[PDB]
Amino acid sequence: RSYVALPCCAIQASAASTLPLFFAVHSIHFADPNHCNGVSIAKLRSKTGDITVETCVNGFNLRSFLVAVVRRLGSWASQENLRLLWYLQRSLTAYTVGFNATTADSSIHN
Amino acid sequence: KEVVLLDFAAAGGELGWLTHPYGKGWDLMQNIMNDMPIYMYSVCNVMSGDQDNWLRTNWVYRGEAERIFIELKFTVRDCNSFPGASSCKETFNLYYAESDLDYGTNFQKRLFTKIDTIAPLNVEERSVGPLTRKGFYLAFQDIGACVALLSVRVYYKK
Amino acid sequence: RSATQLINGRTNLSIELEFNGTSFFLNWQNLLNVITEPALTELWTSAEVAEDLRVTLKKRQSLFFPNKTVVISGDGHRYTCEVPTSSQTYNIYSALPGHLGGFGINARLVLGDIFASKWSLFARDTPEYRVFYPMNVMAVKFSISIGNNESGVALYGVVSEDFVVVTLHNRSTASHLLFGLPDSLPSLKGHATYDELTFARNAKYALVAILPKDSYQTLLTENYTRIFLNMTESTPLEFTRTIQTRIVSIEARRACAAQEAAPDIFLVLFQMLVAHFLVARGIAEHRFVEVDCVCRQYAELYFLRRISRLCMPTFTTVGYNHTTLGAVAATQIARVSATKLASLPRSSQETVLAMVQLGARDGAVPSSILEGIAMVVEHMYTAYTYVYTLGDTERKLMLDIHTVLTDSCPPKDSGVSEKLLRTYLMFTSMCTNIELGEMIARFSKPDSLNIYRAFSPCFLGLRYDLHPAKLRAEAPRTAVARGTSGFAELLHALHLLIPAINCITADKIIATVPLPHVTYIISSEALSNAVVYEVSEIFLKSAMFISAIKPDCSGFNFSQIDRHIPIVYNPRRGCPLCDSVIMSYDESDGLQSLMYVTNERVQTNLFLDKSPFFDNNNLHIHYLWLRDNGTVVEIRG
Ligand SMILES: *[C@@H]1O[C@H](CO)[C@@H](O[C@@H]2O[C@H](CO)[C@@H](O)[C@H](O)[C@H]2NC(C)=O)[C@H](O)[C@H]1NC(C)=O
Ligand SMILES: *[C@@H]1O[C@H](CO)[C@@H](O[C@@H]2O[C@H](CO)[C@@H](O)[C@H](O)[C@H]2NC(C)=O)[C@H](O)[C@H]1NC(C)=O
Ligand SMILES: *[C@@H]1O[C@H](CO)[C@@H](O)[C@H](O)[C@H]1NC(C)=O
Ligand SMILES: *[C@@H]1O[C@H](CO)[C@@H](O)[C@H](O)[C@H]1NC(C)=O
Ligand SMILES: [Cl-]
Ligand SMILES: [Cl-]
Ligand SMILES: [Cl-]
Ligand SMILES: [Cl-]
Ligand code: NA
Ligand code: NA
Ligand code: NA
Ligand code: NA
Ligand code: NA
Ligand code: NA
Ligand code: NA
Ligand code: NA
Ligand code: NA
Ligand code: NA
Numbered sequence: 001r002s003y004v005a006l007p008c009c010a011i012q013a014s015a016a017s018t019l020p021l022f023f024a025v026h027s028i029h030f031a032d033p034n035h036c037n038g039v040s041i042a043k044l045r046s047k048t049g050d051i052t053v054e055t056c057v058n059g060f061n062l063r064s065f066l067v068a069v070v071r072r073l074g075s076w077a078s079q080e081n082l083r084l085l086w087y088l089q090r091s092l093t094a095y096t097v098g099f100n101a102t103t104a105d106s107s108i109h110n
Numbered sequence: 111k112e113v114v115l116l117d118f119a120a121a122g123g124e125l126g127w128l129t130h131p132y133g134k135g136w137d138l139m140q141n142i143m144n145d146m147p148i149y150m151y152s153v154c155n156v157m158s159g160d161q162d163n164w165l166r167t168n169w170v171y172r173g174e175a176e177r178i179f180i181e182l183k184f185t186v187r188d189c190n191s192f193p194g195a196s197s198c199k200e201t202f203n204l205y206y207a208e209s210d211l212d213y214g215t216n217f218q219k220r221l222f223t224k225i226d227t228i229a230p231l232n233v234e235e236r237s238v239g240p241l242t243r244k245g246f247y248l249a250f251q252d253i254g255a256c257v258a259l260l261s262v263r264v265y266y267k268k
Numbered sequence: 269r270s271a272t273q274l275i276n277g278r279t280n281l282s283i284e285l286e287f288n289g290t291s292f293f294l295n296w297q298n299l300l301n302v303i304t305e306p307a308l309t310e311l312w313t314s315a316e317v318a319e320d321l322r323v324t325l326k327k328r329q330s331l332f333f334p335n336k337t338v339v340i341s342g343d344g345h346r347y348t349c350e351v352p353t354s355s356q357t358y359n360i361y362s363a364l365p366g367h368l369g370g371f372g373i374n375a376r377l378v379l380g381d382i383f384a385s386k387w388s389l390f391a392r393d394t395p396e397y398r399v400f401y402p403m404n405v406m407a408v409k410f411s412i413s414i415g416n417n418e419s420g421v422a423l424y425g426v427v428s429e430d431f432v433v434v435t436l437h438n439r440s441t442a443s444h445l446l447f448g449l450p451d452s453l454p455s456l457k458g459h460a461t462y463d464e465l466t467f468a469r470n471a472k473y474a475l476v477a478i479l480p481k482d483s484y485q486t487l488l489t490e491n492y493t494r495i496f497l498n499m500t501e502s503t504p505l506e507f508t509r510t511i512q513t514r515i516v517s518i519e520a521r522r523a524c525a526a527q528e529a530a531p532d533i534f535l536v537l538f539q540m541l542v543a544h545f546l547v548a549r550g551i552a553e554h555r556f557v558e559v560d561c562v563c564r565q566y567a568e569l570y571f572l573r574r575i576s577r578l579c580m581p582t583f584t585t586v587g588y589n590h591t592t593l594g595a596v597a598a599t600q601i602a603r604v605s606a607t608k609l610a611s612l613p614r615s616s617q618e619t620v621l622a623m624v625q626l627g628a629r630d631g632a633v634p635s636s637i638l639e640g641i642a643m644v645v646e647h648m649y650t651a652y653t654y655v656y657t658l659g660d661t662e663r664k665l666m667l668d669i670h671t672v673l674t675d676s677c678p679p680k681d682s683g684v685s686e687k688l689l690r691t692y693l694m695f696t697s698m699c700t701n702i703e704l705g706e707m708i709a710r711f712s713k714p715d716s717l718n719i720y721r722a723f724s725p726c727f728l729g730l731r732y733d734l735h736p737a738k739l740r741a742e743a744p745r746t747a748v749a750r751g752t753s754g755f756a757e758l759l760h761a762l763h764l765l766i767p768a769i770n771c772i773t774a775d776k777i778i779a780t781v782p783l784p785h786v787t788y789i790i791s792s793e794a795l796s797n798a799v800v801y802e803v804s805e806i807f808l809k810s811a812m813f814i815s816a817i818k819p820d821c822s823g824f825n826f827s828q829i830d831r832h833i834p835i836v837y838n839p840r841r842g843c844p845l846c847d848s849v850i851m852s853y854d855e856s857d858g859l860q861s862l863m864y865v866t867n868e869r870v871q872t873n874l875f876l877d878k879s880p881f882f883d884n885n886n887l888h889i890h891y892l893w894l895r896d897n898g899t900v901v902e903i904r905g
Contacts, residue, residue, distance in 0.1 A: 002284060007286040013320070016316065016319065019317065022308055022311075023271040023274035023305075023308070024274045027284060028281070029284045031286055032285075035287050041321075058321060061319055066283070067455060069308070072307070072403075073303070080292060080293065084283065084294075092461060093461065099328065101322075103325075104321035104325040
């Protein structure tokens with residue numbers, strides 16, 4: 001679950017009710033502000049049987065979730081945890097400077 | 111016209127295909143487009159070098175089909191969209207093989223004839239004929255590409 | 269189904285950058301150990317990671333983002349309760365280091381009293397869930413509810429060891445104000461980060477305002493730099509007192525239950541929470557704290573809470589307990605006797621009163637403290653009769669005395685309750701015409717009004733005529749409309765019959781005068797078991813009846829055959845006025861002043877030019893002498 005063939009995706013209205021449980025997510029795949037037309041999206045990869053399930057999620061919301069998760073580690077936060085936290089903060093602000101109506105539109109990646 | 115013997119996109123995820131490297135290589139994957147589940151067989155081991163990942167379809171009973179058309183709908187991720195191991199490719203290979211019986215999970219690359227190299231949603235179509243045995247398999251070989259194969263439909267005219 | 273079942277031997281949650289090639293990893297087992305499975309589930313659900321980006325854009329565009337964070341290079345004010353090496357320290361009960369609280373104690377226990385109960389915040393059904401991730405913290409909760417559930421508003425906040433968060437909800441979208449440590453503020457959600465919402469910042473503390481663009485215009489136009497400076501660069505004590513002044517200002521406008529000025533009440537609540545927070549932070553940032561200093565801080569905080577509940581009756585606070593500090597204060601105040609308290613300097617006896625507030629146990633003030641209060645008020649009143657004015661220090665002392673006397677079980681012994689009646693009567697003797705005019709003038713200018721100048725002996729008096737119409741008649745620009753109203757408001761909430769004399773009256777009482785051997789009721793009508801005097805030379809609708817009742821409900825030896833008040837004509841050569849009351853009344857506006865004559869100097873000072881009595885320039889004032897044996901006369905000439 002290292003490299004995705006469809007890095008850009010559209011957020012579907014049905015996903016909010018059929019989200020996989022957090023402990024079911026195998027991997028998280030983040031895009032670039034220099035990719036996917038600037039659209040801040042992400043891909044959860046979970047698995048049911050032979051089928052790896054890919055869920056298109058909000059980049060801002062998932063980044064803020066991971067920020068909250070890392071911040072609650074406190075003293076136990078390792079070097080790599082803090083590097084992850086700094087990636088999350090930097091990419092949040094980067095996606096924020098270019099947040100537009102064109103950028104909130106993820107349906108183009110259908 | 112167009113009698114369809116095989117249509118992967120219309121199977122709704124209830125059609126599983128054989129993968130010779132099981133786990134690595136080709137994987138059956140679900141996405142949701144327009145709030146409907148769209149399935150595909152995808153592979154993207156681009157930073158690893160030698161690959162040779164095979165994906166074999168189910169057994170397709172020939173019937174009256176003598177000259178068949180294979181229609182592939184697939185996406186290929188640009189190799190320059192990776193920070194690298196510059197050993198990735200942007201094509202894959204289409205093979206087929208005829209048999210009077212269903213071999214099941216037995217997979218022998220020796221019996222599969224190369225139809226053609228598939229290269230750039232990409233829509234490709236190849237023709238095979240004449241077929242003589244009771245049924246046939248198709249096969250797809252990945253040599254280090256980042257491909258998502260979304261549709262495979264085989265049919266014959268009139 | 270279980271989280272361990274879903275993990276299924278997967279060591280890492282891997283986080284891949286599709287176009288950078290680097291990968292981060294979160295250990296599943298470590299995530300579970302440090303952050304419980306319920307917390308992970310609740311964070312994941314509350315995150316709403318499948319929310320459409322247009323919704324996030326609309327959420328972000330709905331906010332008001334400040335110009336630029338203002339950074340003050342200071343560190344705030346220095347901690348005033350630091351223990352000097354000139355005193356002792358104790359870890360933690362008979363060990364009594366004297367009194368007045370001049371020692372130090374380890375703050376580990378008093379900190380555990382502040383944050384003794386945990387609370388879950390930003391729950392699913394709450395509006396703050398829209399911007400904060402749910403979290404569990406040790407904190408103290410505050411909640412005001414103004415108006416009905418259809419039109420009202422709900423204000424609610426939380427003071428934790430690391431931050432303060434307060435919320436204003438227009439339906440009883442929401443506005444949020446936070447103050448605290450920038451690295452410890454609660455986790456925000458996708459559409460906003462903390463740096464862009466930080467209005468003012470210290471080297472230690474920061475102020476954040478998450479305000480909707482359509483929120484109350486005063487919140488948006490409010491200058492939070494000035495608020496932050498007044499919050500940090502002053503000691504928490506004077507800041508608490510400024511917040512008390514602001515609560516008094518809200519009281520003087522009849523705005524305690526008004527839907528309007530809800531953002532003003534919101535700011536006041538934010539500041540009160542910040543005051544509690546700063547006191548608690550001072551407690552935590554130091555290994556040992558000074559007992560009397562912390563007791564003063566706690567007393568000011570408790571007075572702020574109580575006066576806020578007086579204004580807005582729905583004001584609720586849960587968490588801020590002071591059991592151990594209260595026990596320390598209990599040991600300190602048990603030594604203080606009446607003469608000891610009355611001989612202390614004003615500041616030291618104020619400290620004693622604060623410790624009495626904190627160490628009240630089951631709402632029972634020691635009898636020694638009450639007798640000392642009587643002696644203090646006696647000296648204060650005897651001295652008042654020289655200049656007929658009161659400084660702000662004396663009014664602050666009276667405010668402390670009023671805070672101690674309210675919420676105190678009545679005295680069990682007869683003598684101490686009698687002395688309490690005496691100090692009440694002296695407070696009435698200080699609530700004269702001059703005092704009413706001065707208080708009206710002070711309340712007419714709410715800007716220059718502070719908590720000390722707003723306090724008056726009238727708040728501890730036995731006058732019951734202090735209503736808006738009477739006060740209007742007692743006032744000397746056009747601000748008298750406001751000054752008379754607000755004062756009345758603060759009189760209705762801070763005033764106080766349960767002593768003696770049960771021998772059948774109503775609420776038509778103008779005043780009550782409890783002398784040693786007779787009690788006078790100045791009422792609108794006569795009384796059954798009493799000697800009644802009809803007040804002469806007064807307007808029909810201001811008509812008064814002075815009913816004299818003895819405390820043992822027994823009759824007098826003299827028997828008047830007429831309820832007229834006889835007249836006598838034409839200082840002193842001994843003390844004929846001792847143990848009596850001199851009362852003035854206006855022919856149209858009824859009662860003006862009444863003074864208990866405690867000693868010879870009160871008697872002789874009654875005849876000074878600044879005295880409220882015997883002003884020959886007044887063509888419609890009458891003076892009555894109320895003696896201790898039940899006789900009432902009129903002084904003329
Ligand atoms: C908000 O209040 C602050 C209080 O300090 C004002 O800041 C000061 O303003 C004076 C002039 O009024 C300047 O001389 C100081 O240098 C300012 N100090 C700081 C730290 O900024 C601020 O001007 C007020 N804002 C508004 C809009 O009135
Ligand atoms: C109640 O006490 C007053 C004094 O407070 C008494 O007043 C005296 O009255 C007599 C005659 O009525 C006078 O000769 C005295 O000069 C008065 N004394 C003073 C100080 O003025 C009054 O008599 C007492 N009444 C009763 C019923 O005992
Ligand atoms: C938003 O930003 C993009 C740049 O990525 C720009 O092309 C687009 O026109 C902008 N849209 C609006 C509505 O400003
Ligand atoms: C999980 O991540 C840690 C570093 O966080 C790494 O040492 C370990 O090899 C990783 N294991 C797997 C199976 O990815
Ligand atoms: Cl790194
Ligand atoms: Cl299947
Ligand atoms: Cl499909
Ligand atoms: Cl591509
Ligand atoms: Na992706
Ligand atoms: Na979950
Ligand atoms: Na940036
Ligand atoms: Na398969
Ligand atoms: Na099979
Ligand atoms: Na769960
Ligand atoms: Na809250
Ligand atoms: Na003494
Ligand atoms: Na004085
Ligand atoms: Na009153």
